[PDB]
Amino acid sequence: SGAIYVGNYRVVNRHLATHNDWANLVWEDSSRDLLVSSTTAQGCDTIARCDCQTGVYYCSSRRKHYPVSFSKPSLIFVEASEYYPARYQSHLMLAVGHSEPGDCGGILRCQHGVVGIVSTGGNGLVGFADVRDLLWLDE
Ligand SMILES: NC(=O)[C@H]1CCCN(C(=O)[C@@H](CN2CCCC2)c2ccccc2)C1
Numbered sequence: 001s002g003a004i005y006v007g008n009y010r011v012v013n014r015h016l017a018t019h020n021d022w023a024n025l026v027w028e029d030s031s032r033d034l035l036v037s038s039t040t041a042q043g044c045d046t047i048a049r050c051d052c053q054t055g056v057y058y059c060s061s062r063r064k065h066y067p068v069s070f071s072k073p074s075l076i077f078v079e080a081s082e083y084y085p086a087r088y089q090s091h092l093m094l095a096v097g098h099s100e101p102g103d104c105g106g107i108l109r110c111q112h113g114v115v116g117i118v119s120t121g122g123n124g125l126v127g128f129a130d131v132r133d134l135l136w137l138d139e
């Protein structure tokens, strides 16, 4: 679990969005596993606007933050799960690191701010849904 809080926006994994999130919806994209809902209070996370490929992510299943190198956002095949059939997920970045179901929502950050959130994993890999292209989150 986990979310990004920027301005009057809450960014969560689409597959973990609550009933309150769908009742206050801004934008959602199944192919990216992202959902954005509106908030009454202002958030303080800063979104990174960069091409960094190194950062630190939060891993709830180890209660630890890990430094990682990650790939550029791309269309990656993701195995079928209880939330989606087998499909290509877009804007996804992979790193070598521990992740388990429950870790989705963990933030990945670089020197410029928030890069994305954990969205996939397994076999010693972790995948992050990028949010650096969503320039509208800043206005
Ligand atoms: N964005 C998605 O489509 C994800 C939705 C949740 C599930 N998902 C995953 O990758 C799982 C692993 N899979 C579950 C069934 C086959 C392996 C997982 C593992 C570790 C960390 C996080 C998630 C896919």
Ligand SMILES: [Zn+2]
Binding pocket: 048, 049, 050, 051, 052, 110, 111, 112, 113
């Ligand atoms: Zn950066």
